[PDB]
Structure formats: C-alpha cells, structure tokens
Design a protein around this motif. Sequence first.
Motif, PDB file in Angstrom:
ATOM      1  N   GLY A   7     -39.163 -66.699 -34.163  1.00  0.00           N
ATOM      2  CA  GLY A   7     -39.633 -67.663 -33.202  1.00  0.00           C
ATOM      3  C   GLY A   7     -40.154 -66.748 -31.831  1.00  0.00           C
ATOM      4  O   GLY A   7     -39.743 -65.635 -31.651  1.00  0.00           O
ATOM      5  N   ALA A   8     -40.950 -67.397 -30.875  1.00  0.00           N
ATOM      6  CA  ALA A   8     -41.947 -66.892 -30.258  1.00  0.00           C
ATOM      7  C   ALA A   8     -41.220 -65.682 -29.351  1.00  0.00           C
ATOM      8  O   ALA A   8     -40.265 -65.809 -28.782  1.00  0.00           O
ATOM      9  N   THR A   9     -42.011 -64.440 -29.510  1.00  0.00           N
ATOM     10  CA  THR A   9     -41.376 -63.282 -28.966  1.00  0.00           C
ATOM     11  C   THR A   9     -42.100 -63.016 -27.634  1.00  0.00           C
ATOM     12  O   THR A   9     -43.518 -62.943 -27.615  1.00  0.00           O
ATOM     13  N   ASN A  10     -41.558 -62.575 -26.587  1.00  0.00           N
ATOM     14  CA  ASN A  10     -42.096 -62.111 -25.422  1.00  0.00           C
ATOM     15  C   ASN A  10     -42.267 -60.832 -25.404  1.00  0.00           C
ATOM     16  O   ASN A  10     -41.206 -59.847 -24.915  1.00  0.00           O
ATOM     17  N   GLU A  11     -42.903 -60.118 -26.266  1.00  0.00           N
ATOM     18  CA  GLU A  11     -43.165 -58.765 -26.317  1.00  0.00           C
ATOM     19  C   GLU A  11     -44.339 -58.162 -25.942  1.00  0.00           C
ATOM     20  O   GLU A  11     -45.207 -58.906 -25.665  1.00  0.00           O
ATOM     21  N   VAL A  12     -44.333 -56.918 -25.598  1.00  0.00           N
ATOM     22  CA  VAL A  12     -45.490 -56.168 -25.030  1.00  0.00           C
ATOM     23  C   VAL A  12     -46.278 -55.274 -26.268  1.00  0.00           C
ATOM     24  O   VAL A  12     -45.688 -54.518 -26.847  1.00  0.00           O
ATOM     25  N   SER A  13     -47.378 -55.920 -26.604  1.00  0.00           N
ATOM     26  CA  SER A  13     -48.345 -55.295 -27.691  1.00  0.00           C
ATOM     27  C   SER A  13     -49.641 -54.988 -27.203  1.00  0.00           C
ATOM     28  O   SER A  13     -50.521 -55.907 -27.064  1.00  0.00           O
ATOM     29  N   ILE A  14     -49.802 -53.793 -26.736  1.00  0.00           N
ATOM     30  CA  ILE A  14     -51.062 -53.349 -26.015  1.00  0.00           C
ATOM     31  C   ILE A  14     -52.070 -53.088 -27.235  1.00  0.00           C
ATOM     32  O   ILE A  14     -51.958 -52.365 -27.835  1.00  0.00           O
ATOM     33  N   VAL A  15     -53.061 -54.099 -26.923  1.00  0.00           N
ATOM     34  CA  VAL A  15     -54.417 -53.675 -27.852  1.00  0.00           C
ATOM     35  C   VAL A  15     -55.305 -52.813 -27.125  1.00  0.00           C
ATOM     36  O   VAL A  15     -56.171 -53.162 -26.345  1.00  0.00           O
ATOM     37  N   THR A  16     -55.111 -51.883 -27.264  1.00  0.00           N
ATOM     38  CA  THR A  16     -56.105 -50.724 -26.730  1.00  0.00           C
ATOM     39  C   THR A  16     -55.770 -49.586 -27.625  1.00  0.00           C
ATOM     40  O   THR A  16     -54.597 -49.390 -28.219  1.00  0.00           O
ATOM     41  N   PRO A  17     -56.883 -48.845 -27.999  1.00  0.00           N
ATOM     42  CA  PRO A  17     -56.608 -47.738 -28.856  1.00  0.00           C
ATOM     43  C   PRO A  17     -55.656 -46.543 -28.412  1.00  0.00           C
ATOM     44  O   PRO A  17     -55.718 -46.244 -27.259  1.00  0.00           O
ATOM     45  N   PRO A  18     -54.691 -46.284 -29.286  1.00  0.00           N
ATOM     46  CA  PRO A  18     -53.910 -45.259 -28.822  1.00  0.00           C
ATOM     47  C   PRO A  18     -54.416 -43.676 -28.971  1.00  0.00           C
ATOM     48  O   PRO A  18     -54.185 -43.120 -29.529  1.00  0.00           O
TER      49      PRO A  18
END
Lengths: 185, 160, 70, 172, 161
Positions: free
Chosen positions: C18-29
């Motif tokens: 179920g919907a996760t309040n997570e941080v998924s940075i879409v920027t190149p590492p």
Amino acid sequence: ARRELAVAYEDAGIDLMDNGKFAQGLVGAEAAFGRYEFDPIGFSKYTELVPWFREAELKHGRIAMLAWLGLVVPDFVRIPGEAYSFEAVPRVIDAHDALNADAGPNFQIILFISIVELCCAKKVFEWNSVETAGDYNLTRLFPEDDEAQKQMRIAELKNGRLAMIAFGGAVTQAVITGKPFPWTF
Amino acid sequence: FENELGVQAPTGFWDPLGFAKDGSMKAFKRRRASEIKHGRIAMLATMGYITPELTGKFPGLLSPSMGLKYEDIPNGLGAISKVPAVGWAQILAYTFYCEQSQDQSEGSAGEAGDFGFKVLTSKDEEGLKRKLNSELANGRLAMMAIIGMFFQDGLTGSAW
Amino acid sequence: RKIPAGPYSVSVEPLRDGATNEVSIVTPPISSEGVQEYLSLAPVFFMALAIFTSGFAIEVLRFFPDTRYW
Amino acid sequence: GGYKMSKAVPFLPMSPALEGYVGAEEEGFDPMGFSLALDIRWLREAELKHGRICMLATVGWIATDLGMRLPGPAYQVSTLEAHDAMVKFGPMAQILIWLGIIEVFSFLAITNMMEGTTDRQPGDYGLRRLYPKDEEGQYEMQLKELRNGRLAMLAFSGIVTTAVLTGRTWPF
Amino acid sequence: ESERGAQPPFGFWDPLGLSADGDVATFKRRRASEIKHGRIAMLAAMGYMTPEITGKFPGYLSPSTGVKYADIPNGLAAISKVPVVGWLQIFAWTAVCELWEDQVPGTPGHEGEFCFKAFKVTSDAPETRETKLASELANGRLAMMAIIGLFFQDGLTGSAY
Ligand code: CLA
Ligand SMILES: CC(=O)O[C@H]1CC(C)(C)C(=C=C/C(C)=C/C=C/C(C)=C/C=C/C=C(C)/C=C/C=C(C)/C=C/[C@@]23O[C@]2(C)C[C@@H](O)CC3(C)C)[C@](C)(O)C1
Ligand code: KC1
Ligand code: KC1
Ligand SMILES: CC1=C(C#C/C(C)=C/C=C/C(C)=C/C=C/C=C(C)/C=C/C=C(C)/C=C/[C@@]23O[C@]2(C)C[C@@H](O)CC3(C)C)C(C)(C)C[C@H](O)C1
C-alpha cells in the motif's frame, strides 16, 4: 467512523481485492426506496479505480454546485466594478467570453485552480482509498457518530449529482434561450 | 444537555430545530463557538452603528491622503465601498490575526471564546457563570439587533 | 530486482505494498570524482583542447586581423 | 497513530525528506512532493539562495524607486529601464562577474557538502555573527530567515509585476 | 537585580512599569539595548551640538556631486542632503562597529564588552570600573532623553534649535 485521515492513509493505494459489496462499499446508492445500485454500464466492476471514480464524482459535484450557484446568483447581483456590471456583461454566460485573456479575472481563477489542483494531485494519485476518496480534511462541520456521517455523505452526493445535471441543463437552457435565472423560453 | 451555560430565566433550552436531534458533542462545540463569536461581532457592529450618531464621528483623517474625515462616509451600507480598500485590508488583517493568533479547532480553547482577553472577568466567585450567561444572552440580543438594523438600513436606503 | 529494469536505474522496485510515503530521488547519483574522471576522457579532453586552440586562434585573428606584422 | 501529516496541507502526509529541517516541524508544506523526487539539501539551498536574492532585490527596488540613486548621470534612470541602461553601461556585466565568482564558490560548497567532505548545512556558509548560541535560538533565527525570504520572494514578484503593469514607484 | 547597574541617585531601582519580573536573559538583553542606546545618544548629541558651537564645515562632503559640508542643515534636514552613498557608508561603519565581534547572549558583546578599550580601567582597580560604567550608563540615559527632545524640537520648530 470517519477514521481520521492520518490513520486512514495506512490503507491507501490502489486496492487489488474486491470487498464483495457494491462499488467497494461506497456511500451513495442510498435511494429513497431501498438502494439504487445504479452502475448500469459496469464501471464499478473495475474495482481498483472505484476510489478514483468516487473522487471524480465528488470533484464534479462540488464544481457543479459552485457553478450552478455562480450562474444563478450573478443574474441578480454583480461584483462591484464596471467590468462586471449588468451593462458590460448582459448575461452570465457572456461572463466567460467577456473577461478571459488580458482582462485578468478568469485567468486568475484558472491559475489558482491549477495551483490548488496540482498541490492536491498527490491526494488523487496515491493517498486515495475507498474511505478517503474525496476527503480533503475539510470536515469541521461533519457530524459525529456513523449514520449521521453517512447521511451527510449521501446528501453531498445527491446534491452534487443534482447540481451536475442542473448545470448541464442551465448552460444549455441559457445558450438556447439567453435569459435570467429562470431560463425558460 | 443543559448545564453548560446558555440557560436562563426566559427559557432554558430554546431550539425547536437545529439541535433538535440532541447529542452531538462536537456539533454543539462548534455551534457554541459560532454563537459566542457571532455575539461578539454583533455587539461590536451594533456599537459601531450607534456611535456615529450618539457620539461625534472621529474628527481625524482615516485616509490622510484622501481626506476621509469620517463624516463624509455613512453609517451602514455604502461605507463598505467608501472606506478605502487599503484600509479594509488592514481591518480584515486585524480580524485575521485575532482569529489565528490562538487556535480555534476542535478540542482547543478556541472553540470556547477563550482567546486570553479577560479584562471584564469577575473575581472567580462562580459569578462568571452569570457573566458568561450574560455573554450568550447579550450576544443573542445584539445579533438580533445587528441584523435588524442591517435590514432597517437596507430597506430605508440609509442608516435609518 | 525481479521486475526487469535497466542497469543504473533510479527506480524503486515496483513490487510495493500500500501507498508508501518514501523518498525516491530521481536524479542521477553522479559523483564529483566520477564527473572529473569523465571530463578527463581523451575525447572530452582533446576536444576541449581543440576548442580552446580554435578560440585562441579566433581571438588572435579578431584582435590582429590578417598578418599585418609579417 | 502514524503518517505524520503536513501541518500546512492537512490531507497529505509530510514528506520524510523534510525531517530535521527548519520549516517542517510547524508547516511541512510539500504538497507536490518535490522533496520526494529531488534532494532536499539541494532544494533548501535553492530556497535560501532565492530568499536571500529576493530580500536584497526587494530593498533594491525600494531604494531605486524612492529616489535612492548613485551619484552619476548614467544612474538617473527609472527602475523599469534600469536593467537596460545599466546593461548597456557595463555594471550589469560587472555584477554578473562578481556574482559568478561567488556562485562558483557556492558550487564548490554544494559539491563538497553532498559528498560528506564537510558537515555544512544547506543554507550555511559560515556567517555566524548575529547567530544565537542556544539551539532553540538558532532554529528560531533560521525560521525567521526562511519566512522573510519567502515573503520577500512573493513581495518582489508582486512589486516587479505591478511596476511593469502600472509604472509607479512602489506604494502604487 | 536591584543591586545591578548604576543607580547614581542611589536607592533608585526603577522598574516603574514592573518591566523586569525576574529573568536574567531578558534583563541582560535590555541592558545591552540600553547601553547601546546610551552610546548612540551621546554620540548623536555630540554630532548635534558640534555643528552649532564650532561650525567647522570645511570643504565638500561630495566633491563630485557638489554636496558641501556647509550646505547640509544641522539636524533632521540632514537625511535628504548627505549624499546617498554617504549615508550608505555611515550605515556601513555602523555595521562594522556592530558586526566585528559577537553581541549574542553568552558572549562579552551581550554585556557591552567590546574591543574599543579607550578607557582601560586597569583591572588591578576593579572599583573605578563600576564608577566608569555607571557614569557611562547614566550619561547615556541623560543624552537619551536629550537627543529625543532635540529631535522633537527640530521637528516642531522647523530647524535644529
Ligand atoms: C449564528 C446564530 C446562532 C447559533 C449558531 C446559535 C447556537 C446555539 N444556540 Mg442560539 N440564539 C441565536 C443565534 C444563534 N445561536 C439568536 C439570535 C437567539 C435569540 C433568539 C438565540 C437564542 C437561543 C436560546 C434562547 C437558546 C439558544 C441555544 C443555542 C445552542 C443550542 C441550539 C443549537 O445548536 O442551535 C444551532 C444553531 C441554529 C439552529 C441557528 C442556525 C440559523 C437557522 C438555521 C436560521 C435562522 C434564520 C433567522 C431566524 C433569520 C435571519 C434573517 C434571514 C431571513 C436573512 C447553540 C450553541 C440554547 C442553549 O444555550 O443551549 C444550552 C438555548 O436555550 N439560542
Ligand atoms: C434596497 C434594498 O432594500 O436592498 C436591501 C435588502 C436588505 C435585505 C434589506 C439588505 C439588508 C440587510 C442585511 C445585509 C441583512 C442580513 C442578511 C444576512 C446576514 C444574510 C446572511 C445569511 C447567512 C446565513 C443564513 C447562514 C446560514 C448558515 C446556516 C443556516 C448553517 C446551517 C447548517 O446546515 C449546515 C451548513 C451544517 C449543519 O450540520 C448544521 C447547520 C447549522 C444546520 C441589503 C442587503 O442591505 C439591501
Ligand atoms: C501602528 C500601526 C499602524 C500604522 C502606522 C497605521 C497607519 C495608517 N493607517 Mg492604519 N490601522 C492599524 C495599524 C496602523 N495603521 C490597525 C491595527 C488598524 C485596525 C485594523 C488600522 C486601521 C486602519 C484603517 C481602517 C485605515 C488605516 C489607514 C492608515 C493610514 C493612511 C494612509 C493614507 O491614507 O495615506 C496610515 C498612515 C487608512 C488607509 O487609507 O490606509 C492607507 C484607513 O482607512 N488604518
Ligand atoms: C579609505 C576608504 C575610503 C575611501 C577611499 C573613501 C572615499 C570616498 N568617500 Mg568615504 N568613508 C569611508 C571610507 C572611505 N571613503 C569611511 C570609513 C567612512 C565613515 C562612514 C566614510 C564616509 C563617507 C561619507 C559620509 C561620504 C563618503 C564619500 C566618499 C567619496 C566621494 C565620492 C565622490 O564624490 O564621487 C570618496 C571618494 C562622500 C561622497 O561624496 O559620496 C559620493 C560621502 O558623502 N565617505
Ligand atoms: C504562507 C506562508 C507565507 C506566506 C505568505 C504569503 C503572504 C503568501 C502570498 C502569496 C501571494 C500573494 C501570491 C500572489 C498571487 C497573485 C497572483 C497569482 C496574481 C495574479 C494576477 C494576474 C494573473 C493578472 C491579471 C491581469 O494581469 C492581467 C492578466 C492583465 C491586466 O490587464 C489585468 C490584470 C492585472 C488583472 C510566509 C509567511 C511568507 C512564509 C510562511 O512560511 C508560509
């Protein structure tokens, strides 16, 4: 049992199972005589997007209610200012194609609606379940208990659907007739 | 559901409809907050409607740039459009601060008229029950009066 | 990574509850050391050298048009 | 019970990237979830840089439109045409050069804070001066900086928009 | 805190409006504020009396613009005519005087202890120290009332005196 939104979001997301009820147990069938489980086409069979359908219905009903009220009221009283006077814009339907563009007001309303809808887009996509649906945490005067909450939800739904249909035949009744609040010929 | 103020000799519980269904603790909380605040606003508006006639209207400038000597503008309708919008903004800003300095949500002291103003208290002799029943009844009368003079003004065109 | 995703992916695994309040940075590492290493590549370094030489010649031709001092 | 909500937007859970930052414990306003997709350190750096730039720009516009003008014949232009007369005059490129030096060193600061070579906080550049020693005072001062920056961003936006629309000084 | 400070008239601890109910942090903040205010008032009252007693306006304040020391009227009329960056530089010197060292609670600046050291009370005698600082505080208060009265006189009469 409104289930305060902070704990309500624990069951958010696109639900994959089926409750076995009508459209995921949504309030709204609730007709005068019994329950009018309408859904003739079968969109409620698409159970995972039933909360999406409820959110869409609630948003449409709210926008409708406001729009019907806002093409009924101006035919009686206008906002102070020459651009909104009864002489500059003779009819309410003319108010759209009267300001627009570089006059300011309608563009500002569109801009603020866009901002408030982009800010609340995270509520529709993700953080949207069967119970939340259209719950933007504006309850305040949302009565306690459980059956009172159901009665207010069905009141909102019936008024919203009624206002959608009314606004439809109202913009229609005004384009073909061009008359004040009673849009009869 | 009677004891928390609002009860007096003319009538204890006067509500044919509205709270007709009874119960509804949160509903009565919000309704009591609305009644108390509405009474306060009505008191202020009634006094501001009688002052321009019982007392000399402010001899100042209100708008020194535009010379708003407080006598050219009327008492009631029109004065909304007469007081400058840049002054109505500050009036609504004072209202904004006085309604956001303290909370007003459910379960807070805000839904009781408790905003830390005091001044006209009592000696805490439980005559504050009398003072708060005066709050409610006086506000009810002031609100009946404020909308009565609203209508009076509108139907007669001017202040009276 | 059961879901087939390309190498060097900033995508969270699509198999979530179920919907996760997570941080998924879409920027190149990306890495500062890595960026400096990349700009030190023979193609990059020598094309930068060629651009610098060409621009230096451009400026010399601009401020000293033709071979007037031959 | 869970899902600490945004005190600003009460129908959206607060982004976990906001934890430990100044404006989260009281406002937590990230409805679009930029911090969920962008590095919150970079976002705070951008926000504070914008706030400081706008706080300088607002008072610059105030001074320029109130008659505060440098002692030069070339400087006697209105604020609207100030950034054409000064562009042609030269000082705009000069300010660009010096701010470019400062921003190159800011780039070094950013590309050293991200790799852990420094414990530098996003908005920090080392200027303590009027900085409380007590941690609560530091937090309140940072909140004041952020709120003033945001207010001046909006204020300068309105100032420039209204000045371009209706050419006036500032009170309009 | 009644035994702190100066109280030159003696027995004159004056909370009047009961300003300090007892809190060391707020009292120290207000003490720094009062000492800074007194220093500012004494300096300003000097810069207000000096242009009248010894006129001494030699040369141009702005050689380029043309602002002469002798054309700036003494008093409030000064803030339209002292050159733009002249006021900017005066403000900048105030900034240097206030930002060179730390004036935050928990530091000597919060107590008024600065880097001037132009009296050097010679710590071996930590008794003329109290006299010097008490005189500084009392004189600052006197020049405080003085400078605000002078500004009001300038506003009412139309000129400095
Ligand atoms: C904003 C208006 C307002 C509100 C919210 C309340 C709220 C309340 N009053 Mg109250 N009251 C008011 C105005 C109001 N009062 C006025 C003006 C009077 C003088 C007649 C009274 C006299 C009064 C008495 C004597 C008693 C209460 C009581 C109560 C409490 C229980 C009843 C209830 O929940 O009603 C909810 C609120 C309402 C039903 C009011 C809603 C407004 C209705 C729907 C329409 C009214 C239209 C109006 C008559 C016409 C206006 C002009 C219009 C045509 C333009 C509750 C806290 C009782 C109490 O204290 O309990 C212990 C009690 O015994 N009230
Ligand atoms: C020339 C000429 O003559 O023209 C004149 C005309 C005239 C009339 C004389 C004038 C006047 C005087 C005035 C302004 C008189 C006042 C009018 C008012 C106060 C109107 C506001 C009503 C708000 C209401 C009912 C809110 C009601 C809210 C309600 C009922 C809430 C209702 C709840 O259902 C909700 C929403 C949730 C429920 O769970 C609980 C309950 C409480 C039941 C003019 C305008 O000057 C001009
Ligand atoms: C101490 C802070 C303070 C100052 C310093 C100040 C000063 C001015 N006020 Mg103000 N004010 C408050 C605070 C302050 N006001 C507060 C708490 C309220 C109660 C809500 C209030 C009420 C109004 C109203 C109703 C009007 C108003 C205005 C002006 C005005 C005119 C300028 C001009 O006309 O050129 C000036 C200089 C009038 C207006 O026109 O504003 C442009 C106007 O009508 N004010
Ligand atoms: C050693 C560093 C230094 C230099 C080199 C320098 C030079 C100039 N100063 Mg300055 N100055 C300080 C430092 C320096 N000043 C300091 C510490 C203060 C104490 C606050 C101060 C005060 C003022 C004031 C009050 C004014 C002023 C101005 C000018 C001016 C004229 C330019 C022109 O005429 O084009 C020139 C060349 C006057 C003015 O005319 O500005 C247009 C003006 O009013 N200055
Ligand atoms: C909440 C918060 C804060 C805050 C705040 C505040 C004060 C926020 C305020 C934000 C604000 C005030 C945002 C402006 C909106 C105005 C708009 C969009 C203008 C539209 C105007 C438009 C689109 C123009 C229309 C026209 O031009 C056209 C199209 C042509 C002309 O012929 C006609 C006109 C001119 C009409 C703090 C305290 C700062 C920080 C804290 O932490 C959090």
